[PDB]
Design a protein around this ligand. Structure first.
Ligand SMILES: Nc1ncnc2c1ncn2[C@@H]1O[C@H](CSCC[C@H](N)C(=O)O)[C@@H](O)[C@H]1O
Length: 238
């Protein structure tokens, strides 16, 4: 066992101490921890997401990831030589798992930081070639503001989000049509940091992207229903 490797005993001990995991943890063919009942609602193919991300942003060498959870997408993005990733995560318990993942895998081109995207001054972060914003936009109170924050630091966003499939009866805030609800996402460790969230209807999601500066929007995937809809878009700004 190479001197750079964490002992399997320590991998096991720390993985167990870090339970409960959301997406589980396996290394060297050993399943140390299982994920949650609703982990299926989150990224389960980080390698495929990273491929799609780098198809969209082939030149990217400095990437910002928002809502890094247990570091699965962070690690997949970091496999590339010549890239550096900053992953922001709002829940300390999740961040500790992501930090463990990076240590086990020796992923030295990753930095992870605790941060609340609703209050962070994004102008302190520097510039990024692109922002990964997956599974997060429906966990904040003012989603349009998170998109503006991405545009403050980058000209590219890979956005995976839900939106609400109807406009009738929605509230209005900053001119956007919003479904304002208590934060009750089925996965407790995926929840936002406010008591409430606002979902957008489709028109308001696209307006919010445009108003942030992401004026070219490519739809990679969309699933529509009357209520919860899913979309993956690449937004590009001037
Ligand atoms: N205000 C906030 N600031 C920072 N992280 C937040 C946040 N609100 C929610 N999060 C984090 O964002 C993640 C949402 S779940 C999505 C995880 C991952 N991006 C994926 O696509 O599968 C969780 O790790 C959650 O703790």
């Amino acid at each position: 066992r190479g001197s750079h490797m964490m002992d399997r005993r320590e991998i096991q001990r720390r993985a167990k101490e870090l339970e409960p995991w959301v997406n589980g943890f396996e290394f060297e063919g050993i399943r140390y921890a299982e994920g949650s009942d609703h982990g299926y609602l989150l990224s389960q193919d980080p390698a495929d997401r990273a491929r799609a991300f780098y198809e969209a942003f082939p030149g990217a060498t400095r990437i910002l990831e928002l809502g890094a959870l247990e570091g699965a997408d962070t690690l997949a993005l970091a496999r590339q030589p010549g890239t550096s990733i900053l992953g922001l995560e709002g829940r300390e318990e999740n961040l500790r798992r992501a930090e463990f993942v990076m240590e086990v895998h020796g992923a030295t081109n990753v930095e992870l930081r605790i941060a609340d995207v609703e209050t962070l001054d994004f102008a302190t972060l520097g510039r990024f070639d692109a922002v990964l914003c997956a599974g997060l936009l429906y966990h904040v109170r003012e989603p349009w503001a998170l998109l503006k924050d991405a545009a403050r630091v980058s000209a590219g966003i890979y956005l995976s989000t839900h939106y609400w499939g109807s406009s009738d009866g929605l509230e209005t805030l900053d001119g956007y049509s919003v479904k304002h609800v208590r934060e009750e996402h089925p996965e407790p460790q995926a929840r936002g940091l406010s008591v409430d969230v606002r979902w957008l209807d489709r028109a308001s999601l696209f307006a919010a992207l445009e108003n942030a500066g992401f004026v070219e929007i490519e739809v990679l995937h969309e699933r529509t229903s009357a209520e919860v809809c899913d979309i993956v878009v690449v937004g590009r700004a001037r």
